[PDB]
Design brief:
The protein has 106 residues and is of the alpha/beta class. The protein contains three helices and five strands; from the N terminus they run βαβαβββα. Helices cover 29% and strands 27% of the residues. The longest helix has 16 residues. It starts with a strand and ends with a helix. GO terms for molecular function: DNA polymerase processivity factor activity; protein-disulfide reductase activity. Keywords: Acetylation, Disulfide bond, Electron transport, Host-virus interaction, Redox-active center, Transport.
Length: 106
């Protein structure tokens, strides 16, 4: 709904050239912890509307981007501000913890 669906080719304009904070979830359908956090991202997107944009990159349909960031495992969340990584988080976490993680960087 409010989650931007990324591609290797949309990444630059959607993430690097965007205004304000962007959380990007690197994920894949066969990744258990990834599916575990998928619904929390939908809720975060609605809730932080105006302060943050939430976005997903499926690494199977889009194999280009992950390596540019030295991503080793999934899920990995990168928080972008003004085209640079501000913070990252590897592996699953709760909704509550994700709010803590974002408040720490916004």
């Amino acid at each position: 709904d409010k989650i931007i669906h990324l591609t290797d080719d949309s990444f630059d304009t959607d993430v690097l050239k965007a205004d304000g904070a962007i959380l990007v979830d690197f994920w894949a359908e066969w990744c258990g912890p990834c599916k575990m956090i998928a619904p929390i991202l939908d809720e975060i997107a609605d809730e932080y509307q105006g302060k943050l944009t939430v976005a997903k990159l499926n690494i199977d349909q889009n194999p280009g981007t992950a390596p540019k960031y030295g991503i080793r495992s999934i899920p990995t969340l990168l928080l972008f501000k003004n085209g640079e990584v501000a913070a990252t988080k590897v592996g699953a976490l709760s909704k509550g913890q994700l709010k803590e993680f974002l408040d720490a960087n916004l």
